[PDB]
């Protein structure tokens, strides 16, 4: 079975490097040419880079030409991407893919995340947004990098759960809110946590949100 | 890029079949890849592969099957040994790349 | 360069219809070098359509595609509930591998008028200089969906964000949080925050508003 797995990723500041890596099995590997293709969050796909067989020849899209070389060595099994110089606009998932041999790109890896930012790392502040059917929520401020989970009552509280997609504001911050809807008659009966975790920061926080 | 090969050719009592695979270039390629598949029940197996660089013989990567000859555009490759083989080109350098692929030719046994 | 093209840039159609996906090159490429992928939330992109026809290995036969020269199509016969994704058109054949812009196929289903609430920022919050009034969306349909903020019954402009769920899986709506942020001293300044929605599903604007 054809599988694809990358590695490598990170987040890292501008102009510093990071090298990722594609470990391919359950085929021959040096009967294929391989490429890179990277993701920008909430964007389309955009082609980066392509290697031949042996690796004789390499080419580049023209946002990376200069600053990234791809390389494989056959004898491992291994796809390389030493990507140099970086800049916020390399932010994207990575992408390992196989050419077929009729042409199109058969197989995919799962992909590894990469994030080109100034800022540094920031555990989240986290407000409770408060009713006055209810609803109620958390607002989770002010941290970098992505990702931050948020459960509800130990996660036992799941239904009508918004979680929304986190949002970059101008300081180079994440921020998003967790919301739910609730009966309005169980406020003061029943208790509600917000369960936020930040592992890039090991901040994780629980915030009781009342009337 | 397109690619031309006959759509049937008839193979000898012996099992050897020949056929004559052009290509066109948008450009001019030194630097070519020519592969013959075996296309049946919509899957795809590799017949053989030759590396190309223009006005130096054409060098196959394992001849047990294919032996083939370069003249210009032209390659004009032999079989040995029913589904569709298809004939797929490769313009490596310089760039751009290049990939192209024939119509397919079926070969008949007589 | 190759320029793909796709369209529409949102199908909304119910499961069990027909889908059809346009992709269109700035110049005329083959058949036999162009596919469609399609990309379901969280997950890498999947082959589905090469050489413009042929269809990939464990692909239902519902998906097909046709189509030559500029104007390509895909075809998803009937929808089943999986069906609803992104789907990319690439040509493959010269190099630099370029993609189209994406379509997004969405689950059609009758309007529901947005349930609008709003936030005042916490006591906790302005201990740290900043206030943030957030406006929350619930369970709407279709996506569009347009929230202006008014500060003492006067517009606000670029001092707010919004940000909306996928589409849910089971009731199949949207939602949409819109964040307002001040600072503590001009929070302090004024009395009525407002929230007004405009959505198809209500006949006339929508204000959800408090004072402090």
Same mark, same amino acid.
Request: aromatic share 10%.
């Given at each position: ?211 | ?12 009592? +012996?099992?050897?079949? !020949?056929? =004559?695979? &052009? ?11 020519? @592969?013959? #598949? +075996?296309?049946?029940? !919509?899957? =795809?197996? &590799? ?11 054409? @060098?196959? #990567? ?49 | ?212």
């Amino acid at each position: 079975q054809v599988q694809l797995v990358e590695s490598g990723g990170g987040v890292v500041q501008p102009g510093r490097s990071l090298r990722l890596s594609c470990a391919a099995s359950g085929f021959t590997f040096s009967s294929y040419t391989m490429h890179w293709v990277r993701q920008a969050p909430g964007k389309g796909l955009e082609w980066v880079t392509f290697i031949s067989y042996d690796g004789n020849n390499k080419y580049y899209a023209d946002s990376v030409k200069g600053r990234f070389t791809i390389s494989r060595d056959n004898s491992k099994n291994t796809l390389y991407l030493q990507m140099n110089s970086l800049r916020a606009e390399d932010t994207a998932i990575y992408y390992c893919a196989r050419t077929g041999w009729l042409g199109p790109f058969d197989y995919w890896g799962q992909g590894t995340l990469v994030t080109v930012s100034s800022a540094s790392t920031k555990g989240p502040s986290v407000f409770p947004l408060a009713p006055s059917t209810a609803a109620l929520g958390c607002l989770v401020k002010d941290y970098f990098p992505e990702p931050v989970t948020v459960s509800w009552n130990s996660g036992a509280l799941t239904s009508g759960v918004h979680t929304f997609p986190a949002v970059l504001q101008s300081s180079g911050l994440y921020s998003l809110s967790s919301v739910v809807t609730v009966p309005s008659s169980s406020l003061g009966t029943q208790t509600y946590i917000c369960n936020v975790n930040h592992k890039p920061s090991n901040t994780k926080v629980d915030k009781r949100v009342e009337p | 890029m397109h690619v031309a090969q006959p759509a049937v050719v008839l193979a000898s009592s +012996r099992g050897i079949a !020949s056929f =004559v695979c &052009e290509y066109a270039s948008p450009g001019k390629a030194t630097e070519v890849r020519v @592969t013959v #598949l +075996r296309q049946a029940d !919509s899957q =795809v197996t &590799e017949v053989c592969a030759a590396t190309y660089m223009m006005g130096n013989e054409l @060098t196959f #990567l394992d001849d047990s099957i294919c032996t083939g000859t370069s003249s210009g555009n032209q390659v004009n490759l032999t079989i040995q040994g029913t589904g569709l083989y298809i004939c797929k080109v490769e313009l490596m350098y310089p760039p751009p790349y290049y990939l192209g692929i024939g119509n397919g030719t079926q070969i008949y046994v007589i | 360069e190759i320029v793909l093209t796709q369209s529409p840039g949102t199908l909304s159609l119910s499961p069990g219809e027909r889908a059809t996906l346009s992709c269109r090159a700035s110049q005329s490429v083959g058949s036999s070098y162009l596919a469609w992928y399609q990309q379901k939330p969280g997950q890498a992109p999947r082959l589905l359509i090469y050489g413009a026809f042929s269809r990939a290995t464990g692909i239902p036969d519902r998906f097909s595609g046709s189509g030559s020269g500029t104007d390509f199509t895909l075809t998803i016969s009937r929808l089943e509930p999986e069906d609803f994704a992104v789907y990319y058109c690439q040509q493959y054949g010269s190099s630099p591998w370029t993609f189209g812009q994406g379509t997004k196929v969405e689950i059609k289903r009758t309007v529901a008028a947005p349930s609008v609430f709003i936030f005042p920022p916490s006591d906790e919050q302005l201990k740290s200089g900043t206030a943030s009034v957030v406006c929350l969306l619930n369970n709407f349909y279709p996506r569009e969906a347009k929230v202006q903020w008014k500060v003492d019954n006067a517009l606000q402009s670029g001092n707010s964000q919004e940000s909306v769920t996928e589409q849910d899986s089971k009731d199949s709506t949207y939602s949409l949080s819109s964040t307002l942020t001040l600072s503590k001293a001009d929070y302090e300044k004024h009395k009525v925050y407002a929230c007004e929605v405009t959505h198809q599903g209500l006949s006339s604007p929508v204000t959800k508003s408090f004072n402090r």
